[PDB]
């Protein structure tokens, strides 16, 4: 297990498993030839199942969300090493959205609604949107009710068809879904965009040999292929460290997030 013939490679389920698996097929191939190893992709049922797999050393690489990374890191020996970069920027934003037809175009209009959230351990579809609503005088459980719909796709669709009159999701996923014709820009209004969040970290199991780790780090950081990178809307991968995610630790402490809800 310090240098196995097969690498288990886990991907956070931020969208439908089918989409996540298809988008990563280019990378799967590249890594297979770069390493001379069998590559198995895993897409779990939710973010917490992925944290528990990290915890029991079942993963070798793991593409986490920022909050899910901070959670897994506390109970696992994984370590960060790369993140997507695009026109010099290594960050993304959370979007607050509203149902256009019902006139939900401002924070005041969220009062008395169902507000759509993603997975409970999501950075841009749970943590950041709840903080943002609170900073505009709306407290969950008294001014509105949240509902956990599991993924960012599901949040976007719920707001568009009015099952929820507002919600919170990652801005790159919203942009992607409009490009594909899934989300109609006339039906969903962007009410706000948060400050920058650090990108999703690629991580690796810590008990892998020094030589393999450097090879993994190099391969990602040196990567330049359009087959691999085009489904990601990225120019490459840039280096990152654990302290890039202290902002996220601060935000989670402030909201009152509970590691025991997500692990054990």
UniProtKB/Swiss-Prot annotation:
CDD domains attached to this UniProt entry: PBP2_PnhD_2 (cd13572)
UniProt cross-references to Gene3D superfamilies, sorted A to Z: Periplasmic binding protein-like II
Keywords: Cell membrane, Lipoprotein, Membrane, Palmitate, Signal
SUPFAM superfamilies: Periplasmic binding protein-like II (SSF53850)
Record's subcellular location: Cell membrane
GO BP term, example: transmembrane transport
InterPro entries assigned to the protein according to its UniProt record, in alphabetical order: PhnD
Gene Ontology CC: one annotated term: ATP-binding cassette (ABC) transporter complex
Topological category with respect to the lipid bilayer: Lipid-anchor
Highest taxon of the lineage: Bacteria
Free-text function comment from the UniProt entry: Probably part of the ABC transporter complex PhnC2D2E2. Binds strongly to methylphosphonate (MPn), ethylphosphonate (EPn) and inorganic phosphite.
Quaternary structure (record): The complex may be composed of two ATP-binding proteins (PhnC2), two transmembrane proteins (PhnE2) and a solute-binding protein (PhnD2).
Record-stated family: Belongs to the phosphate/phosphite/phosphonate binding protein family.
Protein name listed in UniProt: Probable ABC transporter phosphonate/phosphite binding protein PhnD2
Organism: Prochlorococcus marinus (strain MIT 9301)
